[PDB]
Ligand binder design. Structure first.
Ligand SMILES: CCCCCCCCCCCCCCCCCC(=O)OC[C@H](COP(=O)([O-])OCC(O)COP(=O)([O-])OC[C@@H](COC(=O)CCCCCCCCCCCCCCCCC)OC(=O)CCCCCCCCCCCCCCCCC)OC(=O)CCCCCCCCCCCCCCCCC
Ligand SMILES: CCCCCCCCCCCCCCCCCC(=O)OC[C@H](COP(=O)([O-])OCC(O)COP(=O)([O-])OC[C@@H](COC(=O)CCCCCCCCCCCCCCCCC)OC(=O)CCCCCCCCCCCCCCCCC)OC(=O)CCCCCCCCCCCCCCCCC
Ligand SMILES: CCCCCCCCCCCCCCCCCC(=O)OC[C@H](COP(=O)(O)OCCN)OC(=O)CCCCCCCCCCCCCCCCC
Ligand SMILES: CCCCCCCCCCCCO[C@@H]1O[C@H](CO)[C@@H](O[C@H]2O[C@H](CO)[C@@H](O)[C@H](O)[C@H]2O)[C@H](O)[C@H]1O
Ligand SMILES: CCCCCCCCCCCCO[C@@H]1O[C@H](CO)[C@@H](O[C@H]2O[C@H](CO)[C@@H](O)[C@H](O)[C@H]2O)[C@H](O)[C@H]1O
Lengths: 177, 154, 36, 126, 168, 459, 606
């Protein structure tokens, strides 16, 4: 979630993803830990049996065969981590991840209840106000001369400067509010 | 918004097609207009008919649960294809086999229910015998008329 | 595989700021100043 | 393979033959797509993180979509044989069907009521 | 409670007839309820009833003298037709309330008899059936715009039918 | 009735003579008090309907509508107080005058004794409503919407004028009491069938029948909030009221002249309810919901049983209140996000928790929650139509399912889901908006307590 | 009698007290969850008294509180029908809700809006009690539909979850498709009997009562999740575990069975209806037990067990055994709620894990929860003399010795064994195998707000069955004479299923790969009913709505036909007439033609 997807994937990335998915499905099939280890070791043996194949056409054919076999043998109901997409409690706490821009509308009497926190927040808003101009210029100057672009953003190069487009990355609500 | 930025009529020439693609933020080669059947689709791009369920779940989409980024061309059937409705996601079993299996199970169940109806299962006993003319009075019968004497024995 | 130097630097900088913000979120001992 | 796609159960990406293409044309295509997406995302993020914003961020895609599903239709409509027949049937035909259903039912009801076969045991409120 | 209009068979509760050494919780709960709740509530109610005895006032059920029916009205004489129509409406809704009372009798009978209702409620079922036949012959198939004239026309249609049947 | 009409007229001098500062407060207050005064029409302790003079009368059918009209005006002023925030004083006073004039004309219409009162005071409503739509509307197509709204109704109405003149020539009068007490059976001549149509068509158009319902989805998504409220709270019911009052003479032709319109209503109800499922404009979705409900009303009225009439009246009132509330809610979110798309704003329950409560209650009224008068009306209409033909339950059930479905779809799409965090401008709910929703809901709850008030003439 | 009626009304007053307190500023200052728990405890205590009165003199009451309205010879009174069904179920529901409302405080301590959660649970309880103690069909409908709304609000309590939102709308779909039949029953019983009151409806026994009882059967199918409209319940576990425990098992889902029990007198004669219910119950039992097996979620397994039990109750009603079916309702309420609470304890103590593959060795680590779970499972598969046995065994006895559809009987027995099989699935994979949870153990069930409620429900599961069975008055003559195999059929099949399940589960430790199997997939994917129906029907309907209705007709053809055709024609005519070249020569030529035409008209008309 913290890195933009590439334009494509190489054989390395595709095969690694297949390895992970097949291992997790093998675990979902083999409930017991010992059985899971027994079969996962065989799975690594199979995967490495063709580790060094320098005829990329045969490599891709092998990968296609592996993927079709995976789709044939995938567990109908796999194991999903509770917070993982498609798992119970995936978004269970998105109700309470209310954003920070709401505090701007608080009544002054409500702000009175929390004096210090809002002073610190005022400092933060001042910092963002200062840094916006420099960070926009930074992105404009770091734009690639060619017409080839990637989602990944630049770091702070100058000194005393916040990283470009940082307000939304920072300040995001806590996972369990 | 102005005319150039709002949709328009079926792209009738390749220069129109390129202008439309630039309007929709779509590639000149990916942009395909709906067939000119005269049903109002007009210029709108024909996007893949895959539900938002299929979109990458881990990505930080601009519009999150919609799972669409800002400026992305929007399918003509987005409301149907949102995560809360139709799901065109791949299935572990082929749709044809799933249909066969479900309908075959239903057929077997109903056929065997008919078999049971035709050939019921019962214990080896006679019908329950009730007294007083099969309770003529207290089973809803007129006092004046006399029911046929229904008798019981040992 | 592995972060680029730019990515590593960016993530470190955002890490520092993120942790400063999270510490900012702490409430001081008197913070729930209940009015009378 | 053994899988057979259906319109409501798409072909999995891994089984998709084209996902494995590595033609330079395909890779150039994908790079250009990513370029468009990155440019759009940068445009969005500038507005998202601008501290001087005072309002929401308008969505050109949403505006275009609604306009296309509303006011562009009739201007981009043309009668055709298929359209005429489909409209005429989908409009009138259901009405004719329900007409015949209700008329036959109510005529049979009136016939029975006239003769006196129907018994209105406790219809008091009708 | 006019027992006539709202008939209520007599009560026939049986003897305590205890056969257990154990104490029945119900009698003691009922004694506690009586003393604790019923007694103060009765005191309050008695106070209210004394307060009512003071400042007593009377209200009288209105009596509506009869007036010519629609049969006595010359066609298009709105002046008399209005009075005939209003009389008919009042009779209509009084009949409605008759039906309500008889239906309430039927429901109370069913509840009272319980599983003997299939025989002991025959009398009230018969009364309900006769009154609903009367109601059907009086006001049924009359449109939402039911009126004395429609009722008269319906009655005359039925009377013509009966006369034909008698002739044949 | 002249103790209710004259104060309404005097509101206008108050509106125009008040100081710029206190004008809104004064008119709102005095309009509430006029609403209070209008309750005198509920002291009907006898079956003899009220006839205050040769000109004005009241009935069990007209009293609830008149009281509803009186109730709406204060709420219309509150709803309009905002979008008129930065207009010049004379323009604001013009708007207020238009609303006051609309109330006056509608009360007079509902309290009119002669159908050629009714035909004039009914069409006089077109001018204020047309001005409200065209002058103060937002988007450009408001002109087209105004044209549709005007001319659909005028084309419907002119044949009504011709039929009414023929009626007067044939009978000698047009006082509804006299027509009722001297009516006579029509014969199935072609000319009589043409009449039946001429009498019924104007009202059917105002009760948009499935084939002539194109002027609501336009008028509503082009009209301001007050225009939408008055329109689809009272104007739509003008058609039903006219139909109810006038059908007395048009018998027995109805038995077979109702098959077409009963069928069109019972089918268009399903079609429009389904349209509500896949519409991307909240205002439009509400408008099509209204079209379906009026389809039910038309079917019941055109079958004419006691249940039909009583349930039709109950549902008329219930829809009035509920649709009004829904439109105020949608306008509430519109005043902030300046868009009418439903998809755009989502998860607003995370920032307007109480207005989410009002949304939920409104959706329940729409979906017909027992024991709400909305349900009671729909249930009794269903009983009537089932008696009329036992097969209508199929259409009724399909419509019930789809009604529940779009009613909950609105809520899930908007109130629930991830908050569109990019919306910085979402501001805390105004006490004005909250009080407006409360004033819409509370009457509904009280009438659900006391349904006897809102039954029709029959029951 | 005063005491009985007063207590009946006081129960509802007490249940409303928390709501009114909620709509006030005192909610902030009081510990609302404890207040509501106390109110529920007191309400249960009050309810006990009418239960004792009924057990003594078995007198049933019709109590008419308020006269809502009179509709031309059809009064609508707020009526209450207190009898065996209503009284016993009020007692049971209050007991189970007391336990679950105390347990909700523990399970939901962290969550904000706990006050709203408690308020919603209470509201549901009021609505369900309205359903049970209802004489008018209209009031029964109030209950029927209000419980549906509360279920919508509680499922997807976490309105963040798109999945939970879909689940709530799924429930509304299926429930409303059910309620169509209910409204049909209402309208038919209004036209043919002119009253919605049960007492008056009773006199329709001599009619056909097919058109109305079909509506009742459909409504019961929808609400109780019988096979036709079953998907809603299993996927209604997206909500909080307390909601699943209370609503969607113990109290709500019994609505269809309760309605059919209430209308037992009318359905005695209509054999068609009774056979239909027999078949439907059998099919649901077998189907949802198949799905129950091979399911890896602790809550979904119990959900499918609940559906199977409800199918069994449907069979119970299919044979003329309404009292026994209701007995099964009440008896299973206890141990189903207990099983849900034990599962909730496990899920909470572990890091919100609900897969039975990442749970193991619980018996050693959480002795109390595992002990109560074992009691619950042994009650679900009625072992002799526990709560289940004092109902399910008699049900199976009547099934095996009543004239019945042979196939229905067979699948019912197989599903009875298969219940043992999946209960073993749970007891094994969640309590017997070596641990599988994440390393950082942090397990605490010592909280009294969890221990005591489960203790109470376990005492219920251990005694209430016998107590109720021995105290209830005679109702249905049971068949007690039968062969040895029929007499002990339930026990032999249940034990055989347990042993088979043990063999199969123990076979998993064998170091061999389990392969994808057609039957395994059919079971796990829930028969494909979701995957197929929920992807074809919504798509087709929604596509039709957009294309055929909104587009083809409303936005195109109607506009062309009525407005735009007129607009065109008039523009054509104005452009035909107005455009005149403007020359006097031509104008006077036209005047000449007018001259001639008037002359001709005069001549011919003479
Ligand atoms: C027999 C007939 C029986 C009929 C029962 C039928 C059952 C139908 C079920 C519907 C389900 C509705 C639902 O789910 O809850 C909606 C709604 C949502 O509640 P919530 O989520 O807590 O809202 C909190 C806000 O989001 C955030 O604001 P908050 O947390 O600060 O709220 C505090 C509290 C504050 O509440 C108040 O201040 C109430 C002021 C009430 C004034 C009423 C004046 C009446 C004038 C008469 C003249 O709650 C409210 O604000 C609610 C205001 C709206 C109440 C309107 C009254 C509805 C009565 C329904 C009948 O809950 C209700 O308030 C409904 C009441 C319970 C249903 C009726 C049960 C019968 C009780 C009768 C006494
Ligand atoms: C030892 C201590 C004993 C403690 C008990 C003490 C009793 C006592 O002090 O004397 C009571 C004493 C009565 O003595 P009484 O001589 O026996 O009564 C004379 C009449 O009966 C007086 O009767 P009333 O006509 O004056 O009654 C006034 C009325 C209050 O109403 C009003 O008058 C209007 C007030 C508006 C206020 C607006 C703010 O109260 C009600 O009748 C209740 C209103 C209706 C609530 C229920 C509505 C249910 C709707 C159902 C919808 C659900 C669907 C149904 C589904 C079923 C059908 C299928 O005074 C009272 O009645 C208490 C005051 C009433 C205040 C109620 C206000 C509620 C609003
Ligand atoms: C022998 C016995 C045979 C019995 C046969 C019975 C046949 C089934 C009858 C029930 C019909 C139900 C049709 C639709 C059910 C449905 O799709 O609702 C749930 C589904 C939720 O999606 P879901 O798959 O659960 O999500 C999983 C994770 N994403 O839904 C969705 O995803 C989106 C739902 C939106 C639907 C809105 C459009 C209306 C849907 C159709 C209404 C049909 C009304 C007419 C019904 C007539 C038949 C009764
Ligand atoms: C049964 C009797 C009742 C039915 C009566 C129907 C009468 C309705 C008359 C509505 C007339 C409105 O007239 C309306 O004029 C506007 C002008 O802005 C036209 O507006 C449109 O015209 C053309 C399309 O043909 C476009 O080029 C133009 O840009 C667009 O605005 C509408 O297409 C037309 O509908
Ligand atoms: C039975 C009598 C009923 C009479 C009631 C109905 C009144 C009819 C009104 C007719 C006039 C409507 O006027 C309507 O004007 C619009 C533009 O404004 C015309 O529409 C026009 O749009 C643009 C130019 O503006 C052109 O591209 C288009 O080709 C042209 O048609 C419509 O074709 C015309 O119909």
């Amino acid at each position: 979630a913290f890195c933009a997807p590439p334009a494509y994937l190489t054989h390395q990335q595709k095969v690694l993803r297949l390895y992970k998915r097949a291992l997790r499905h093998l675990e979902s099939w083999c409930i017991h830990r010992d059985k899971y280890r027994y079969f996962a070791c065989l799975m690594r043996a199979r995967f490495e049996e063709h580790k060094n194949e320098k005829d990329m056409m045969r490599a891709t054919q092998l990968l296609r065969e592996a993927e079709e076999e995976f789709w044939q043998n995938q567990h109908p109901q796999p194991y999903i981590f509770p917070d993982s997409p498609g798992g119970t409690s995936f978004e269970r706490y998105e109700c309470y991840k209310v954003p920070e821009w709401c505090l701007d509308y608080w009544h002054p009497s409500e702000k009175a209840m929390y004096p210090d926190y809002f002073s610190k927040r005022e400092q933060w808003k001042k910092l963002r106000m200062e840094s916006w101009d420099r960070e926009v210029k930074q992105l404009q100057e770091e734009t690639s001369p060619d017409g080839i672009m990637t989602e990944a953003l630049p770091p702070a190069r100058r000194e005393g400067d916040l990283p470009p487009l940082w307000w939304h990355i920072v300040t995001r609500p806590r996972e369990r509010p | 918004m102005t005319k150039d930025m709002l949709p328009g009529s079926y792209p009738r020439t390749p220069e129109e097609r390129a202008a439309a693609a630039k309007k929709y933020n779509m590639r000149v080669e990916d942009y395909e207009p709906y067939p000119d059947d005269g049903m109002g689709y007009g210029d709108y791009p024909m996007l893949p008919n895959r539900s938002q369920h299929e979109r990458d779940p881990w990505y930080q989409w601009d519009h999150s649960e919609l799972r669409m980024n800002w400026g992305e061309p929007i399918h003509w059937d987005l409301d149907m294809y949102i995560r809360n409705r139709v799901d065109t996601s791949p299935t572990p079993v082929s749709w044809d086999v799933m249909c066969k299996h479900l309908f075959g199970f239903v057929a077997f169940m109903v056929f065997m229910f008919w078999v049971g109806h035709v050939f019921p299962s019962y214990q080896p006993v006679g019908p329950k015998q009730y007294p007083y003319n099969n309770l003529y009075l207290e089973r809803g019968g007129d006092p004046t008329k006399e029911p046929e004497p229904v008798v019981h024995y040992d | 595989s592995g972060y680029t130097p730019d990515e590593k630097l960016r993530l470190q900088q955002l890490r520092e700021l993120r942790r400063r913000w999270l510490k900012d979120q702490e409430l001081s001992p008197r913070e729930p100043v209940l009015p009378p | 393979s053994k899988y057979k796609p259906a319109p409501l159960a798409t072909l999995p990406s891994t089984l998709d033959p084209a996902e494995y293409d590595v033609s330079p044309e395909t890779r150039r295509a994908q790079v250009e797509r990513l370029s468009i997406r990155a440019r759009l995302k940068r445009e969005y993020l500038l507005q998202y993180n601008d501290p001087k914003r005072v309002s929401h961020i308008e969505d050109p895609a949403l505006i275009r979509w609604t306009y296309a599903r509303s006011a562009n239709i009739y201007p981009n409509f043309r009668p055709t044989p298929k359209n005429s027949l489909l409209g005429a049937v989908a409009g009138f035909g259901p009405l004719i069907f329900w007409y015949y259903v209700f008329k036959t039912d109510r005529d049979r009801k009136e016939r029975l009521i006239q003769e006196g076969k129907l018994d209105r045991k406790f219809n008091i409120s009708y | 409670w006019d027992k006539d209009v709202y008939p209520e068979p007599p009560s026939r509760t049986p003897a305590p007839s205890p056969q257990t050494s154990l104490p029945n919780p119900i009698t003691y709960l009922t004694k506690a309820y009586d003393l604790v709740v019923d007694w103060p509530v009765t005191l309050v109610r008695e106070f209210i009833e004394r307060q009512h005895a003071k400042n007593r006032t009377y209200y009288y059920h209105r009596q509506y003298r009869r007036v010519p029916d629609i049969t006595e009205c010359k066609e298009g004489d709105v002046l008399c037709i209005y009075e005939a129509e209003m009389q008919w409406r009042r009779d209509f809704k009084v009949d409605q309330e008759i039906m309500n009372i008889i239906q309430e009798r039927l429901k109370a009978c069913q509840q009272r008899e319980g599983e003997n209702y299939q025989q002991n409620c025959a009398k009230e079922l018969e009364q309900f059936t006769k009154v609903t036949k009367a109601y059907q012959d009086r006001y049924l198939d009359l449109g939402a715009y039911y009126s004395a004239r429609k009722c008269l026309a319906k009655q005359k249609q039925r009377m013509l039918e009966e006369r034909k049947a008698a002739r044949q | 009735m002249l103790k209710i009409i004259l104060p309404s007229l005097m509101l206008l001098p108050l509106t125009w003579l008040s100081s710029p500062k206190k004008t809104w407060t004064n008119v709102t207050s005095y309009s509430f008090l006029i609403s209070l005064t209008s309750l005198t029409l509920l002291w009907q302790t006898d079956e003899n309907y009220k006839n205050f003079s040769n000109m004005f009368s009241s009935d069990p059918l007209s009293t609830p509508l008149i009281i509803l009209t009186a109730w709406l005006l204060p709420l219309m002023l509150m709803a309009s107080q905002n979008h008129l925030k930065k207009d010049n004083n004379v323009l604001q006073k013009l708007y207020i005058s238009m609303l006051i004039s609309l109330q006056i004309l509608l009360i007079m219409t509902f309290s009119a004794t002669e159908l050629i009162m009714f035909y004039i005071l009914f069409e006089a409503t077109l001018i204020p409503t047309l001005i409200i739509i065209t002058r103060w509307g937002n988007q450009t197509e408001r002109l087209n919407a105004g044209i549709y709204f005007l001319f659909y109704t005028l084309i419907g109405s002119i044949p009504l004028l011709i039929a009414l003149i023929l009626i007067q020539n044939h009978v000698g009068t047009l006082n509804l009491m006299i027509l009722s007490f001297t009516t006579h059976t029509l014969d199935a001549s072609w000319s009589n069938n043409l009449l039946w149509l001429a009498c019924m068509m104007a009202f059917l158009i105002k009760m948009p029948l499935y084939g002539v319902h194109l002027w609501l989805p336009k008028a509503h998504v082009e009209a301001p909030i007050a225009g939408s409220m008055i329109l689809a709270a009272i104007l739509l019911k003008l058609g039903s009221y006219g139909m109810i009052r006038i059908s007395i003479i048009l018998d027995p032709l109805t038995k077979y002249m109702a098959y077409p319109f009963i069928l069109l209503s019972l089918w268009g109800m399903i079609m429009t309810s389904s349209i509500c499922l896949r519409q991307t404009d909240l205002k439009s979705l509400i408008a099509y919901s209204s079209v379906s409900h009026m389809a039910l009303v038309i079917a019941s009225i055109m079958i004419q049983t006691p249940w039909s009439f009583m349930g039709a009246t109950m549902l008329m009132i219930a829809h009035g209140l509920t649709s009004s509330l829904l439109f105020c809610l949608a306008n509430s979110n519109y005043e902030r996000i300046h868009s009418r798309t439903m998809i755009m704003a989502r998860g607003l329950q995370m920032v307007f928790p109480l207005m989410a409560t009002w949304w939920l209650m409104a959706s329940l009224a729409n979906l017909a929650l027992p024991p709400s008068i909305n349900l009671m009306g729909e249930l009794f209409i269903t009983m009537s139509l089932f008696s009329w033909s036992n097969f209508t339950i199929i259409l009724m059930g399909i419509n019930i399912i789809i009604t529940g479905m779009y009613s909950m779809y609105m809520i899930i799409t908007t109130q629930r889901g991830k908050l569109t965090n990019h919306m910085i401008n979402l501001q805390p709910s105004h006490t004005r908006e909250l009080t407006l929703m409360a004033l819409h809901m509370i009457p509904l709850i009280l009438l659900t307590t006391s349904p006897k008030l809102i039954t029709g003439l029959t029951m | 009698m005063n005491i009985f009626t007063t207590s009946i009304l006081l129960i509802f007053i007490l249940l409303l007290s928390p709501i009114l307190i909620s709509m006030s500023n005192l909610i902030k200052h009081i510990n609302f969850p404890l207040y509501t728990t106390t109110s529920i405890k007191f309400s249960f205590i009050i309810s006990l008294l009418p239960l004792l009165m009924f057990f003594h003199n078995n007198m049933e009451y019709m109590i008419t509180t308020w006269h809502w309205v009179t509709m031309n010879s059809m009064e609508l009174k707020m009526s209450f029908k207190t009898d065996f069904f209503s009284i016993l179920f009020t007692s049971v529901a209050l007991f189970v809700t007391w336990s679950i409302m105390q347990f909700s405080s523990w399970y939901m301590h962290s969550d904000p809006n706990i006050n709203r959660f408690i308020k919603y649970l209470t509201l549901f309880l009021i609505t369900m009690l309205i359903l049970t103690s209802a004489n008018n069909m209209f009031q029964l409908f109030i209950g029927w539909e209000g419980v549906g709304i509360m279920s919508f609000l509680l499922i997807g309590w976490w309105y963040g979850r798109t999945d939970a939102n879909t689940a709530a709308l799924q429930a509304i779909l299926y429930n409303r498709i059910g309620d169509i039949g209910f409204i049909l029953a209402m309208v038919w019983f209004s036209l043919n009997m002119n009253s919605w009151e049960l007492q008056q409806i009773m006199f329709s026994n001599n009619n056909d009562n097919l058109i109305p009882l079909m509506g009742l059967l459909i409504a019961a199918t929808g609400k109780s999740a019988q096979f036709g409209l079953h998907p809603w319940l299993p996927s209604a576990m997206e909500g909080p575990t307390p909601v699943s425990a209370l609503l969607h098992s113990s109290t709500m889902v019994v609505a269809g069975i309760f309605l059919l029990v209430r209308f037992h007198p009318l359905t005695t004669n209509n054999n068609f209806i009774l056979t239909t219910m027999l078949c439907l119950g059998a099919l649901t039992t077998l189907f949802t037990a198949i799905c129950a097996l091979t399911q890896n979620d602790i809550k979904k397994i119990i959900a499918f067990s609940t559906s199977s039990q409800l199918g069994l109750m449907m069979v119970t009603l299919g044979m003329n055994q309404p009292h026994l079916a209701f007995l099964h309702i009440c008896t299973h309420a206890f141990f189903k709620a207990m099983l849900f609470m034990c599962s909730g304890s496990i899920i909470h103590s572990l890091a919100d894990e609900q897969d039975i593959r990442k749970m193991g060795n619980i018996t050693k680590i959480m002795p109390f929860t595992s002990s109560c779970l074992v009691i619950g499972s042994l009650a679900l598969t009625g072992m002799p003399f526990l709560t289940g046995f004092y109902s399910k065994d008699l049900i199976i006895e009547a099934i095996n010795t009543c004239n019945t559809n042979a196939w229905a009987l067979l699948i019912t027995l197989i599903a009875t064994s298969m219940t043992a099989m999946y209960s073993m699935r749970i007891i094994y994979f969640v309590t017997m195998t070596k641990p599988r949870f994440p390393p950082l153990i942090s397990i605490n069930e010592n909280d009294p707000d969890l221990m005591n409620p489960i203790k109470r429900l376990a005492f219920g599961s251990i005694f209430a069955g016998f107590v109720i069975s021995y105290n209830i008055p005679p109702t249905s003559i049971p068949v007690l004479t039968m062969p040895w195999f029929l007499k002990t059929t339930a026990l032999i099949i249940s034990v055989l299923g347990f042993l088979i399940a043990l063999e199969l589960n123990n076979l998993t430790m064998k170091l061999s790969m389990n392969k994808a199997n057609p039957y395994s997939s059919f079971s796990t994917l829930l028969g494909f009913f979701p995957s197929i129906i929920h992807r074809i029907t919504p798509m087709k309907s929604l596509n039709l709505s957009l294309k055929t209705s909104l587009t083809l007709l409303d936005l195109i053809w109607l506009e062309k036909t009525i407005p735009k055709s007129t607009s065109t024609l008039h523009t054509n005519m104005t452009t035909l007439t107005t455009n005149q070249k403007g020359l006097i020569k031509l104008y006077f030529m036209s005047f000449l033609i007018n001259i001639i035409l008037i002359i001709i008209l005069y001549s011919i008309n003479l």
